[PDB]
Amino acid sequence: MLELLLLTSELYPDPVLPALSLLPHTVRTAPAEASSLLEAGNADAVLVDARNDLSSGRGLCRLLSSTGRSIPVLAVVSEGGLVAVSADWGLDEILLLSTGPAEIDARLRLVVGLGKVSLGELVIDEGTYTARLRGRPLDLTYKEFELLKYLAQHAGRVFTRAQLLHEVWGYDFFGGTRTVDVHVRRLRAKLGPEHEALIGTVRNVGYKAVRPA
DNA sequence: TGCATCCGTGAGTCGAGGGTAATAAACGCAGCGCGGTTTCGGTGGAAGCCCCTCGTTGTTTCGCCGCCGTGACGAAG
């Protein structure tokens, strides 16, 4: 009753997951391509092969992730390869290549079968990449909107420039930037006289966010 | 005087390269100095006991990282 779409170059679903033939779910196969995500129709779940290669499997799990709406993404890895399997893959469920038929059935029937938190005086709207600080208008540049976003949810957490750099930027990451200094100085300006006490900037500890009061 | 007759010499620079033999013995005593042995000893290595060498604060100050703004070369439509 589920259409499972395999992105695997094995040309058969059998060595990727052996016991799946014991369940009468339909399996539609294609090589591990992003364009075969356009090959998804009424697929209820999707399995990626990452048994020997954790990197492209994790990135494909990432390629699916955050796109929306979304159909939940699954992957199959090895047991010594479960070290890299984490929440950073964008997984909803991970499968091993030795999980049983009723086990895969239960994981599938679990996974295929609200608003933002208010409020730290900085609302986050995901549409135009902008916020709202005690006032409707709040212009945030491409990276001056996520810098506040990064310090928003991790309020109270201490983050160094590089720790911020690789999540706030791509990052590349360049050096000798002061881009944090350029931003936080700018992010402490468009926030008006009030809420200047939203970021904790003590010397050489990085740039932590201080939540009220 | 000869005159034979022994005789005292040397006769290769150098490499290959360790060794082979014999007759009648016992007792006993003395010194003996090497090695069993037999004393305490104070100076040895602990055990317990007191004056002086090494750690707190009180600044100083270059240094440096956050900040602050500038400008442009970039970034996206």
PDB file of C-alpha atoms (C1' of nucleotides) in Angstrom:
ATOM      1  CA  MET A   1       0.000   0.000   0.000  1.00  0.00           C
ATOM      2  CA  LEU A   2       3.075   2.253  -0.041  1.00  0.00           C
ATOM      3  CA  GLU A   3       5.039   3.326  -3.101  1.00  0.00           C
ATOM      4  CA  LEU A   4       8.708   3.311  -2.100  1.00  0.00           C
ATOM      5  CA  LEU A   5      11.063   5.018  -4.535  1.00  0.00           C
ATOM      6  CA  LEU A   6      14.640   3.737  -4.490  1.00  0.00           C
ATOM      7  CA  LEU A   7      17.443   6.030  -5.624  1.00  0.00           C
ATOM      8  CA  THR A   8      20.018   3.310  -6.158  1.00  0.00           C
ATOM      9  CA  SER A   9      22.175   2.174  -9.072  1.00  0.00           C
ATOM     10  CA  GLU A  10      21.869  -1.528  -8.121  1.00  0.00           C
ATOM     11  CA  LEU A  11      19.146  -1.933 -10.850  1.00  0.00           C
ATOM     12  CA  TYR A  12      17.169  -4.165  -8.407  1.00  0.00           C
ATOM     13  CA  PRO A  13      15.663  -3.379  -4.982  1.00  0.00           C
ATOM     14  CA  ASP A  14      16.826  -6.734  -3.596  1.00  0.00           C
ATOM     15  CA  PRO A  15      20.423  -6.202  -2.272  1.00  0.00           C
ATOM     16  CA  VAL A  16      19.485  -2.701  -1.093  1.00  0.00           C
ATOM     17  CA  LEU A  17      16.826  -4.072   1.277  1.00  0.00           C
ATOM     18  CA  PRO A  18      16.223  -7.848   1.165  1.00  0.00           C
ATOM     19  CA  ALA A  19      13.012  -8.374   3.164  1.00  0.00           C
ATOM     20  CA  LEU A  20      10.990  -5.624   1.437  1.00  0.00           C
ATOM     21  CA  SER A  21       9.682  -8.167  -1.095  1.00  0.00           C
ATOM     22  CA  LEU A  22       8.035  -9.958   1.854  1.00  0.00           C
ATOM     23  CA  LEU A  23       5.782  -6.906   2.211  1.00  0.00           C
ATOM     24  CA  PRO A  24       3.425  -6.106  -0.699  1.00  0.00           C
ATOM     25  CA  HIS A  25       4.508  -2.454  -0.952  1.00  0.00           C
ATOM     26  CA  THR A  26       5.367  -1.351  -4.492  1.00  0.00           C
ATOM     27  CA  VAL A  27       8.962  -0.291  -5.194  1.00  0.00           C
ATOM     28  CA  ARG A  28       9.904   2.000  -8.075  1.00  0.00           C
ATOM     29  CA  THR A  29      13.630   2.263  -8.778  1.00  0.00           C
ATOM     30  CA  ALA A  30      15.897   4.836 -10.425  1.00  0.00           C
ATOM     31  CA  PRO A  31      19.585   5.754 -10.037  1.00  0.00           C
ATOM     32  CA  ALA A  32      20.627   8.029  -7.173  1.00  0.00           C
ATOM     33  CA  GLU A  33      19.793  11.262  -8.995  1.00  0.00           C
ATOM     34  CA  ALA A  34      18.139  14.481  -7.881  1.00  0.00           C
ATOM     35  CA  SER A  35      16.253  14.597 -11.194  1.00  0.00           C
ATOM     36  CA  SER A  36      14.594  11.296 -10.282  1.00  0.00           C
ATOM     37  CA  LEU A  37      12.985  13.181  -7.425  1.00  0.00           C
ATOM     38  CA  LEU A  38      10.958  14.504 -10.365  1.00  0.00           C
ATOM     39  CA  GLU A  39      10.299  10.776 -10.939  1.00  0.00           C
ATOM     40  CA  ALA A  40       8.270  10.827  -7.697  1.00  0.00           C
ATOM     41  CA  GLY A  41       4.518  10.604  -8.212  1.00  0.00           C
ATOM     42  CA  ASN A  42       2.212   9.167  -5.559  1.00  0.00           C
ATOM     43  CA  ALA A  43       5.237   7.834  -3.649  1.00  0.00           C
ATOM     44  CA  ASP A  44       4.546   7.596   0.081  1.00  0.00           C
ATOM     45  CA  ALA A  45       8.179   7.245   1.158  1.00  0.00           C
ATOM     46  CA  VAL A  46      11.631   7.257  -0.399  1.00  0.00           C
ATOM     47  CA  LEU A  47      14.716   5.189   0.454  1.00  0.00           C
ATOM     48  CA  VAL A  48      18.276   6.172  -0.446  1.00  0.00           C
ATOM     49  CA  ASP A  49      21.181   3.724  -0.514  1.00  0.00           C
ATOM     50  CA  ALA A  50      24.121   4.795   1.654  1.00  0.00           C
ATOM     51  CA  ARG A  51      25.536   1.406   2.632  1.00  0.00           C
ATOM     52  CA  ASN A  52      29.125   1.929   1.447  1.00  0.00           C
ATOM     53  CA  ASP A  53      29.027   5.672   0.594  1.00  0.00           C
ATOM     54  CA  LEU A  54      27.741   7.746   3.512  1.00  0.00           C
ATOM     55  CA  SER A  55      28.534  11.076   1.861  1.00  0.00           C
ATOM     56  CA  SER A  56      26.349  11.195  -1.265  1.00  0.00           C
ATOM     57  CA  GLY A  57      23.575   9.365   0.580  1.00  0.00           C
ATOM     58  CA  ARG A  58      23.620  11.924   3.404  1.00  0.00           C
ATOM     59  CA  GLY A  59      23.725  14.780   0.895  1.00  0.00           C
ATOM     60  CA  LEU A  60      20.820  13.303  -1.053  1.00  0.00           C
ATOM     61  CA  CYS A  61      18.926  13.006   2.245  1.00  0.00           C
ATOM     62  CA  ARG A  62      19.893  16.670   2.595  1.00  0.00           C
ATOM     63  CA  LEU A  63      18.922  17.334  -1.021  1.00  0.00           C
ATOM     64  CA  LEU A  64      15.413  16.163  -0.173  1.00  0.00           C
ATOM     65  CA  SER A  65      15.489  17.868   3.223  1.00  0.00           C
ATOM     66  CA  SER A  66      14.024  21.338   3.741  1.00  0.00           C
ATOM     67  CA  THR A  67      12.500  21.339   0.262  1.00  0.00           C
ATOM     68  CA  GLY A  68       9.050  20.578   1.621  1.00  0.00           C
ATOM     69  CA  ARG A  69       6.291  19.809   1.687  1.00  0.00           C
ATOM     70  CA  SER A  70       7.574  16.945   2.334  1.00  0.00           C
ATOM     71  CA  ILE A  71       7.332  13.245   1.698  1.00  0.00           C
ATOM     72  CA  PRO A  72       9.526  11.731   4.465  1.00  0.00           C
ATOM     73  CA  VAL A  73      13.035  10.642   3.450  1.00  0.00           C
ATOM     74  CA  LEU A  74      14.580   7.319   4.495  1.00  0.00           C
ATOM     75  CA  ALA A  75      18.054   5.842   3.957  1.00  0.00           C
ATOM     76  CA  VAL A  76      19.780   2.464   4.289  1.00  0.00           C
ATOM     77  CA  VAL A  77      23.321   2.366   5.734  1.00  0.00           C
ATOM     78  CA  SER A  78      25.553  -0.237   7.339  1.00  0.00           C
ATOM     79  CA  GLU A  79      25.946  -0.936  11.047  1.00  0.00           C
ATOM     80  CA  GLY A  80      29.495   0.403  11.251  1.00  0.00           C
ATOM     81  CA  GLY A  81      28.228   3.376   9.212  1.00  0.00           C
ATOM     82  CA  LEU A  82      25.613   4.376  11.788  1.00  0.00           C
ATOM     83  CA  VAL A  83      28.192   6.753  13.314  1.00  0.00           C
ATOM     84  CA  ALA A  84      27.441   9.414  10.689  1.00  0.00           C
ATOM     85  CA  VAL A  85      23.667   8.832  10.725  1.00  0.00           C
ATOM     86  CA  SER A  86      22.309  11.743  12.749  1.00  0.00           C
ATOM     87  CA  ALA A  87      19.671  14.463  12.870  1.00  0.00           C
ATOM     88  CA  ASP A  88      21.792  16.589  10.504  1.00  0.00           C
ATOM     89  CA  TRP A  89      20.857  14.359   7.541  1.00  0.00           C
ATOM     90  CA  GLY A  90      17.310  15.710   7.564  1.00  0.00           C
ATOM     91  CA  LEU A  91      16.100  12.154   8.181  1.00  0.00           C
ATOM     92  CA  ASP A  92      12.670  11.230   9.399  1.00  0.00           C
ATOM     93  CA  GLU A  93      13.610   7.542   9.700  1.00  0.00           C
ATOM     94  CA  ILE A  94      16.788   5.523   9.159  1.00  0.00           C
ATOM     95  CA  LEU A  95      16.773   1.879   8.065  1.00  0.00           C
ATOM     96  CA  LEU A  96      19.528  -0.692   8.340  1.00  0.00           C
ATOM     97  CA  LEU A  97      20.122  -3.302   5.627  1.00  0.00           C
ATOM     98  CA  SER A  98      19.148  -6.029   8.133  1.00  0.00           C
ATOM     99  CA  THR A  99      15.847  -4.686   9.511  1.00  0.00           C
ATOM    100  CA  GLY A 100      12.978  -7.181   9.382  1.00  0.00           C
ATOM    101  CA  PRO A 101       9.778  -7.001   7.310  1.00  0.00           C
ATOM    102  CA  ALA A 102       7.381  -6.125  10.142  1.00  0.00           C
ATOM    103  CA  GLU A 103      10.041  -3.703  11.392  1.00  0.00           C
ATOM    104  CA  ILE A 104      10.128  -1.837   8.058  1.00  0.00           C
ATOM    105  CA  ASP A 105       6.311  -2.055   8.080  1.00  0.00           C
ATOM    106  CA  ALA A 106       6.115  -0.448  11.534  1.00  0.00           C
ATOM    107  CA  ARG A 107       8.654   2.284  10.704  1.00  0.00           C
ATOM    108  CA  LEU A 108       6.782   3.111   7.489  1.00  0.00           C
ATOM    109  CA  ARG A 109       3.306   3.089   9.091  1.00  0.00           C
ATOM    110  CA  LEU A 110       4.684   5.312  11.856  1.00  0.00           C
ATOM    111  CA  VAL A 111       6.361   7.918   9.660  1.00  0.00           C
ATOM    112  CA  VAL A 112       3.970   8.206   6.695  1.00  0.00           C
ATOM    113  CA  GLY A 113       1.043   7.532   9.041  1.00  0.00           C
ATOM    114  CA  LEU A 114       1.622  24.517  13.849  1.00  0.00           C
ATOM    115  CA  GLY A 115       2.892  28.072  14.232  1.00  0.00           C
ATOM    116  CA  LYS A 116       6.183  29.578  15.351  1.00  0.00           C
ATOM    117  CA  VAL A 117       7.025  30.326  18.976  1.00  0.00           C
ATOM    118  CA  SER A 118       5.841  33.679  20.332  1.00  0.00           C
ATOM    119  CA  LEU A 119       7.805  35.695  21.173  1.00  0.00           C
ATOM    120  CA  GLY A 120      11.272  37.107  21.827  1.00  0.00           C
ATOM    121  CA  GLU A 121      10.420  40.524  20.331  1.00  0.00           C
ATOM    122  CA  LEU A 122      11.916  39.297  17.041  1.00  0.00           C
ATOM    123  CA  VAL A 123       9.379  37.461  14.905  1.00  0.00           C
ATOM    124  CA  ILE A 124      10.786  35.330  12.085  1.00  0.00           C
ATOM    125  CA  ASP A 125       8.862  35.243   8.813  1.00  0.00           C
ATOM    126  CA  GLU A 126      10.336  32.759   6.337  1.00  0.00           C
ATOM    127  CA  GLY A 127       8.932  34.398   3.195  1.00  0.00           C
ATOM    128  CA  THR A 128      10.915  37.563   2.468  1.00  0.00           C
ATOM    129  CA  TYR A 129      13.854  36.702   4.753  1.00  0.00           C
ATOM    130  CA  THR A 130      13.018  39.372   7.333  1.00  0.00           C
ATOM    131  CA  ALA A 131      11.982  39.770  10.967  1.00  0.00           C
ATOM    132  CA  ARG A 132       9.974  42.137  13.165  1.00  0.00           C
ATOM    133  CA  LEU A 133      11.331  43.838  16.297  1.00  0.00           C
ATOM    134  CA  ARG A 134       8.656  45.819  18.154  1.00  0.00           C
ATOM    135  CA  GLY A 135       7.691  47.173  14.733  1.00  0.00           C
ATOM    136  CA  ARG A 136       6.476  45.900  11.374  1.00  0.00           C
ATOM    137  CA  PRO A 137       9.497  47.017   9.296  1.00  0.00           C
ATOM    138  CA  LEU A 138      12.765  45.150   9.772  1.00  0.00           C
ATOM    139  CA  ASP A 139      15.052  44.953   6.736  1.00  0.00           C
ATOM    140  CA  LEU A 140      17.534  42.077   6.874  1.00  0.00           C
ATOM    141  CA  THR A 141      20.104  41.350   4.181  1.00  0.00           C
ATOM    142  CA  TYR A 142      20.661  37.848   2.807  1.00  0.00           C
ATOM    143  CA  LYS A 143      22.937  37.041   5.768  1.00  0.00           C
ATOM    144  CA  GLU A 144      21.662  39.660   8.238  1.00  0.00           C
ATOM    145  CA  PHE A 145      18.358  37.756   8.523  1.00  0.00           C
ATOM    146  CA  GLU A 146      19.751  34.324   9.409  1.00  0.00           C
ATOM    147  CA  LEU A 147      22.368  35.737  11.776  1.00  0.00           C
ATOM    148  CA  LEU A 148      19.485  36.994  13.898  1.00  0.00           C
ATOM    149  CA  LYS A 149      17.716  33.701  13.190  1.00  0.00           C
ATOM    150  CA  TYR A 150      20.733  31.687  14.359  1.00  0.00           C
ATOM    151  CA  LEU A 151      20.973  33.676  17.597  1.00  0.00           C
ATOM    152  CA  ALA A 152      17.178  33.546  17.907  1.00  0.00           C
ATOM    153  CA  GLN A 153      16.548  29.832  18.461  1.00  0.00           C
ATOM    154  CA  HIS A 154      19.928  29.348  20.173  1.00  0.00           C
ATOM    155  CA  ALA A 155      19.132  32.206  22.534  1.00  0.00           C
ATOM    156  CA  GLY A 156      21.525  32.155  25.465  1.00  0.00           C
ATOM    157  CA  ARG A 157      23.959  29.870  23.626  1.00  0.00           C
ATOM    158  CA  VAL A 158      27.540  30.982  23.046  1.00  0.00           C
ATOM    159  CA  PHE A 159      28.733  30.777  19.452  1.00  0.00           C
ATOM    160  CA  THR A 160      32.163  31.724  18.171  1.00  0.00           C
ATOM    161  CA  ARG A 161      32.663  33.567  14.885  1.00  0.00           C
ATOM    162  CA  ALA A 162      33.654  30.372  13.068  1.00  0.00           C
ATOM    163  CA  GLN A 163      30.939  28.430  14.899  1.00  0.00           C
ATOM    164  CA  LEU A 164      28.518  31.047  13.594  1.00  0.00           C
ATOM    165  CA  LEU A 165      30.348  31.268  10.270  1.00  0.00           C
ATOM    166  CA  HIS A 166      29.682  27.777   8.926  1.00  0.00           C
ATOM    167  CA  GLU A 167      25.948  27.893   9.725  1.00  0.00           C
ATOM    168  CA  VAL A 168      25.249  31.589   9.091  1.00  0.00           C
ATOM    169  CA  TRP A 169      27.281  31.605   5.886  1.00  0.00           C
ATOM    170  CA  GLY A 170      27.435  28.618   3.552  1.00  0.00           C
ATOM    171  CA  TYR A 171      30.208  28.809   4.548  1.00  0.00           C
ATOM    172  CA  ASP A 172      33.281  28.923   2.320  1.00  0.00           C
ATOM    173  CA  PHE A 173      34.702  29.996   4.720  1.00  0.00           C
ATOM    174  CA  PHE A 174      36.890  33.051   4.200  1.00  0.00           C
ATOM    175  CA  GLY A 175      39.101  34.574   6.876  1.00  0.00           C
ATOM    176  CA  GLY A 176      40.037  37.989   8.229  1.00  0.00           C
ATOM    177  CA  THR A 177      36.391  38.874   7.775  1.00  0.00           C
ATOM    178  CA  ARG A 178      34.944  40.974  10.605  1.00  0.00           C
ATOM    179  CA  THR A 179      31.753  40.090   8.729  1.00  0.00           C
ATOM    180  CA  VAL A 180      30.383  39.141  12.128  1.00  0.00           C
ATOM    181  CA  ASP A 181      31.559  42.574  13.309  1.00  0.00           C
ATOM    182  CA  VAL A 182      30.084  44.137  10.158  1.00  0.00           C
ATOM    183  CA  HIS A 183      26.816  42.287  10.733  1.00  0.00           C
ATOM    184  CA  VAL A 184      26.358  42.429  14.506  1.00  0.00           C
ATOM    185  CA  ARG A 185      27.296  46.108  14.394  1.00  0.00           C
ATOM    186  CA  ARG A 186      24.635  46.424  11.694  1.00  0.00           C
ATOM    187  CA  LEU A 187      22.270  44.001  13.437  1.00  0.00           C
ATOM    188  CA  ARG A 188      22.670  46.116  16.586  1.00  0.00           C
ATOM    189  CA  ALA A 189      21.718  49.235  14.576  1.00  0.00           C
ATOM    190  CA  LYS A 190      18.552  48.319  12.652  1.00  0.00           C
ATOM    191  CA  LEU A 191      17.179  46.912  15.925  1.00  0.00           C
ATOM    192  CA  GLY A 192      16.815  50.463  17.232  1.00  0.00           C
ATOM    193  CA  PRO A 193      17.856  51.710  20.659  1.00  0.00           C
ATOM    194  CA  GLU A 194      15.740  48.984  22.236  1.00  0.00           C
ATOM    195  CA  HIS A 195      16.675  45.303  21.999  1.00  0.00           C
ATOM    196  CA  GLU A 196      20.317  46.275  21.666  1.00  0.00           C
ATOM    197  CA  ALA A 197      20.586  43.922  24.670  1.00  0.00           C
ATOM    198  CA  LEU A 198      19.615  40.889  22.566  1.00  0.00           C
ATOM    199  CA  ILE A 199      23.166  39.758  21.696  1.00  0.00           C
ATOM    200  CA  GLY A 200      25.871  38.968  24.227  1.00  0.00           C
ATOM    201  CA  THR A 201      29.262  40.106  22.928  1.00  0.00           C
ATOM    202  CA  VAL A 202      31.958  39.586  25.555  1.00  0.00           C
ATOM    203  CA  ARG A 203      35.569  39.790  24.482  1.00  0.00           C
ATOM    204  CA  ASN A 204      36.824  36.745  22.571  1.00  0.00           C
ATOM    205  CA  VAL A 205      34.056  34.410  23.763  1.00  0.00           C
ATOM    206  CA  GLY A 206      32.442  34.839  20.362  1.00  0.00           C
ATOM    207  CA  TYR A 207      28.946  36.270  19.993  1.00  0.00           C
ATOM    208  CA  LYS A 208      26.296  34.799  22.292  1.00  0.00           C
ATOM    209  CA  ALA A 209      22.630  35.753  22.307  1.00  0.00           C
ATOM    210  CA  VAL A 210      21.222  37.069  25.590  1.00  0.00           C
ATOM    211  CA  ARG A 211      17.472  36.512  25.958  1.00  0.00           C
ATOM    212  CA  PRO A 212      15.316  38.758  28.161  1.00  0.00           C
ATOM    213  CA  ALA A 213      14.833  39.877  30.727  1.00  0.00           C
TER     214      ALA A 213
ATOM    215  C1'  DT B   1     158.758 -23.635   7.536  1.00  0.00           C
ATOM    216  C1'  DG B   2     155.184 -25.635   5.397  1.00  0.00           C
ATOM    217  C1'  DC B   3     151.375 -28.099   5.390  1.00  0.00           C
ATOM    218  C1'  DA B   4     147.506 -30.541   5.905  1.00  0.00           C
ATOM    219  C1'  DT B   5     143.270 -30.106   8.284  1.00  0.00           C
ATOM    220  C1'  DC B   6     139.412 -28.508  10.793  1.00  0.00           C
ATOM    221  C1'  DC B   7     136.448 -24.941  10.834  1.00  0.00           C
ATOM    222  C1'  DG B   8     133.462 -20.736  11.174  1.00  0.00           C
ATOM    223  C1'  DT B   9     131.065 -18.482   8.666  1.00  0.00           C
ATOM    224  C1'  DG B  10     126.774 -17.071   4.985  1.00  0.00           C
ATOM    225  C1'  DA B  11     123.786 -19.094   1.616  1.00  0.00           C
ATOM    226  C1'  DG B  12     116.242 -14.427  -0.616  1.00  0.00           C
ATOM    227  C1'  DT B  13     112.273 -10.198  -0.263  1.00  0.00           C
ATOM    228  C1'  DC B  14     108.926 -12.708   1.120  1.00  0.00           C
ATOM    229  C1'  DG B  15     102.588 -15.231   2.008  1.00  0.00           C
ATOM    230  C1'  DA B  16     100.780 -20.691   3.663  1.00  0.00           C
ATOM    231  C1'  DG B  17     101.324 -20.835   9.792  1.00  0.00           C
ATOM    232  C1'  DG B  18      99.376 -22.666  17.441  1.00  0.00           C
ATOM    233  C1'  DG B  19     101.150 -27.919  21.394  1.00  0.00           C
ATOM    234  C1'  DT B  20     104.988 -33.119  20.562  1.00  0.00           C
ATOM    235  C1'  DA B  21     107.587 -37.393  26.430  1.00  0.00           C
ATOM    236  C1'  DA B  22     108.857 -39.858  32.038  1.00  0.00           C
ATOM    237  C1'  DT B  23     109.670 -43.152  37.359  1.00  0.00           C
ATOM    238  C1'  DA B  24     109.677 -48.105  43.423  1.00  0.00           C
ATOM    239  C1'  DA B  25     107.562 -43.657  48.479  1.00  0.00           C
ATOM    240  C1'  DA B  26     105.883 -42.949  52.188  1.00  0.00           C
ATOM    241  C1'  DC B  27     105.308 -41.424  57.937  1.00  0.00           C
ATOM    242  C1'  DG B  28     105.728 -37.648  60.888  1.00  0.00           C
ATOM    243  C1'  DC B  29     106.597 -33.064  62.990  1.00  0.00           C
ATOM    244  C1'  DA B  30     106.424 -27.574  62.820  1.00  0.00           C
ATOM    245  C1'  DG B  31     105.191 -23.410  61.189  1.00  0.00           C
ATOM    246  C1'  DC B  32     101.807 -22.003  59.507  1.00  0.00           C
ATOM    247  C1'  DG B  33      98.557 -18.174  57.760  1.00  0.00           C
ATOM    248  C1'  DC B  34      93.704 -18.828  55.807  1.00  0.00           C
ATOM    249  C1'  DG B  35      89.546 -19.473  57.426  1.00  0.00           C
ATOM    250  C1'  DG B  36      86.043 -21.120  60.963  1.00  0.00           C
ATOM    251  C1'  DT B  37      84.775 -18.918  65.234  1.00  0.00           C
ATOM    252  C1'  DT B  38      83.621 -14.981  69.257  1.00  0.00           C
ATOM    253  C1'  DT B  39      83.390  -9.851  71.704  1.00  0.00           C
ATOM    254  C1'  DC B  40      80.724  -4.602  71.543  1.00  0.00           C
ATOM    255  C1'  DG B  41      81.001  -0.520  69.149  1.00  0.00           C
ATOM    256  C1'  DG B  42      79.794   3.971  68.091  1.00  0.00           C
ATOM    257  C1'  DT B  43      78.459   5.599  63.988  1.00  0.00           C
ATOM    258  C1'  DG B  44      76.001   4.599  61.358  1.00  0.00           C
ATOM    259  C1'  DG B  45      70.806   5.291  59.392  1.00  0.00           C
ATOM    260  C1'  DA B  46      66.264   6.256  61.442  1.00  0.00           C
ATOM    261  C1'  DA B  47      63.135   9.027  64.878  1.00  0.00           C
ATOM    262  C1'  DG B  48      61.696  13.177  66.854  1.00  0.00           C
ATOM    263  C1'  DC B  49      62.656  18.498  67.358  1.00  0.00           C
ATOM    264  C1'  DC B  50      63.499  24.423  66.112  1.00  0.00           C
ATOM    265  C1'  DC B  51      64.889  29.280  62.426  1.00  0.00           C
ATOM    266  C1'  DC B  52      64.828  31.177  58.100  1.00  0.00           C
ATOM    267  C1'  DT B  53      63.505  30.726  52.122  1.00  0.00           C
ATOM    268  C1'  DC B  54      59.780  31.269  48.797  1.00  0.00           C
ATOM    269  C1'  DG B  55      54.270  32.453  47.413  1.00  0.00           C
ATOM    270  C1'  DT B  56      49.455  36.781  47.946  1.00  0.00           C
ATOM    271  C1'  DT B  57      48.113  41.348  46.330  1.00  0.00           C
ATOM    272  C1'  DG B  58      48.423  45.719  43.892  1.00  0.00           C
ATOM    273  C1'  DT B  59      49.363  47.980  40.092  1.00  0.00           C
ATOM    274  C1'  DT B  60      50.941  48.931  34.876  1.00  0.00           C
ATOM    275  C1'  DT B  61      50.379  48.841  30.691  1.00  0.00           C
ATOM    276  C1'  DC B  62      50.849  47.121  25.828  1.00  0.00           C
ATOM    277  C1'  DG B  63      48.046  44.487  23.517  1.00  0.00           C
ATOM    278  C1'  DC B  64      44.170  42.993  21.106  1.00  0.00           C
ATOM    279  C1'  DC B  65      39.679  41.597  19.977  1.00  0.00           C
ATOM    280  C1'  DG B  66      35.029  43.404  19.930  1.00  0.00           C
ATOM    281  C1'  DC B  67      32.868  47.727  17.751  1.00  0.00           C
ATOM    282  C1'  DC B  68      32.491  51.032  14.815  1.00  0.00           C
ATOM    283  C1'  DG B  69      32.183  53.001  10.828  1.00  0.00           C
ATOM    284  C1'  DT B  70      33.998  53.202   5.414  1.00  0.00           C
ATOM    285  C1'  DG B  71      34.054  51.833   0.948  1.00  0.00           C
ATOM    286  C1'  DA B  72      33.822  48.937  -2.839  1.00  0.00           C
ATOM    287  C1'  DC B  73      33.635  45.130  -5.120  1.00  0.00           C
ATOM    288  C1'  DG B  74      30.730  42.554  -5.347  1.00  0.00           C
ATOM    289  C1'  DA B  75      25.257  40.011  -5.736  1.00  0.00           C
ATOM    290  C1'  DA B  76      20.850  39.651  -7.220  1.00  0.00           C
ATOM    291  C1'  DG B  77      16.989  41.090 -10.190  1.00  0.00           C
TER     292       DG B  77
END
